[PDB]
């Protein structure tokens, strides 16, 4: 599980609410291509690949746009190229969750200058979620996750030796990512219910019930 392959995966794939949902649908296609470039993912059974992506797609995409936004002041950069300021998000009725992303993810990524290898490793940990329901062999996904965080810790110790707490600092952003992912899903289901926000085919499929 070499960190070089994980970094290569990141580099290979590099009403505001309506724009956000359009960017999210676009990035779902690219997310599948990213996962295929993480070591050993494509060797899992197809049903397990589906389970892992349906379980992690929203956290995976939130981590990505948050890190893309580190040089944006008080805003985010959509994958479509549109900058969205927090004033625009508040004026559209999603100010609270937008501020959570800025304060708990973007600003904290900026403050520690989280790099793209660390980002990719955190996303690979999220992808290899052994708690995902229905996996044919959870122990093998657990083993892949363990390989990722072992490689990440060694990377942090080699590249940032004067920061012994950095590995723990990276992992302790995952509870915030989990909570923000769940809250974003609540909003999307509500937009779907109200019907006043376009939702494209792949995003809509991710909002479908599982089989």
């Amino acid at each position: 599980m070499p960190v070089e392959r994980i970094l290569e995966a990141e580099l290979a794939v590099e009403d505001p609410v309506t724009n956000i949902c359009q960017a999210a649908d676009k990035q779902l296609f690219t997310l599948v291509e990213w996962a295929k470039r993480i070591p050993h993912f494509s060797e899992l059974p197809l049903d397990d690949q589906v389970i892992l992506l349906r379980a992690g797609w929203n956290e995976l995409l939130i981590a990505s746009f948050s890190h893309r936004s580190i040089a944006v002041k008080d805003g985010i950069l959509l994958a479509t190229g549109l900058h969205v300021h927090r004033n625009s998000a508040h004026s559209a009725g999603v100010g609270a969750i937008f501020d959570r992303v800025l304060t708990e993810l973007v600003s904290k990524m900026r403050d520690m200058q989280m790099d793209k290898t660390e980002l990719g490793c955190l996303r690979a940990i999220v992808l290899f979620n052994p708690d995902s329901k229905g996996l044919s062999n959870p122990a093998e996904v657990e083993a892949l996750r363990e390989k990722v965080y072992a490689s990440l810790e060694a990377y942090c110790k080699h590249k940032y030796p004067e920061q012994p707490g950095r590995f723990a600092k990276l992992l302790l952003r995952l509870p915030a990512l989990r909570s923000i992912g769940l809250k974003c899903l609540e909003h999307l289901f509500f937009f779907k219910l109200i019907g006043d926000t376009p939702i494209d085919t792949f995003l809509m499929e991710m909002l479908e019930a599982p089989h």
Binding site: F29, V32, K36, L46, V50, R54, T201, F202, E205, E208
Partner: peptide, 9 residues
Amino acid sequence: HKILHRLLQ
């Protein structure tokens, strides 16, 4: 899961 399966080929 139709789109997701097709993309995972």
